[PDB]
Amino acid sequence: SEALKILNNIRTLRAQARESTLETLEEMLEKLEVVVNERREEESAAAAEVEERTRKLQQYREMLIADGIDPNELLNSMAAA
Amino acid sequence: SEALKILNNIRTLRAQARESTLETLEEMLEKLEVVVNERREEESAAAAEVEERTRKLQQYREMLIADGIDPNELLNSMAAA
């Protein structure tokens, strides 16, 4: 990328910044800023969606062994019926 | 059976029955009827304890499904960790 290239670098920015009135920058930040969250969303969203799943395993791992249940055999018991 | 095989037929029972005094008879039913409970328990046992095991394979199918879970993969999941 050619744009992002520069928007990662302060001194380079400050420069290309002098170019435009606050009005722009300020407004156009707001813009960036949302995009960001827009991601911070998907990210934090699929975070729960996942971990949550595997937490179930821990508990099942437990509730199976807690009801004594052996792993292998029993899994099939519910895999064929 | 040589023995019991006959005691299946009232007629015939009624028969080798005339022979003894209810005194005894009375008393030997006592005997038997207990013996049957001797079993009644053992049996009434394993059933419960078996319908018990299988019963959770109800609550689990119902929980897997109820937590939107494909058995297949998820079986192996807890198997490795």
CATH number for the domain harbouring residue A14 = 1.10.287.1050
The verdict on B80 touching A (C-beta cutoff 8 Å) is no
Q: Which experiment gave this structure?
A: X-ray
Q: Is A24 in a helix, a strand, or coil?
A: helix
d(CA B72, CA A41) in angstroms, rounded, equals: 30
Please indicate whether, in this complex, the C-beta atoms of A81 and B57 are within 8 angstroms of each other: yes
Report which DSSP code applies to B48: H
Resolution of the experimentally solved model in angstroms: 3.7
A-chain residue closest to B77, CA distance? A57
Which residue segment(s) compose the domain that B35 sits in? Answer: 1-81
Structural domain total, chain B: 1
- Residue of A58, A64, A51, A28 whose CA lies nearest to B59: A64
Q: Is A2 in a helix, a strand, or coil?
A: coil
Query: For chain A, first and last CA: distance in Å?
Result: 55
Query: For chain B, first and last CA: distance in Å?
Result: 54
Out of A54, A71, A79, the one facing B71 most closely (by C-beta) is A79
- Residue of A36, A46, A48, A37 whose CA lies nearest to A7: A36
The answer to whether B81 touches A57, Cβ cutoff 8 Å, is yes
- Residue of A43, A12, A26 whose CA lies nearest to A4: A12
- Find where tokens 């960036």 sit: A32
In Å, how far is A4's CA from the nearest CA of chain B?
41
Q: Give the largest CA-CA distance in chain B.
A: 71
The verdict on A61 touching B (C-beta cutoff 8 Å) is yes
Which residues make Cβ contacts (< 8 Å) with residue A57, sequence separation at least 6?
B74, B77, B78, B81
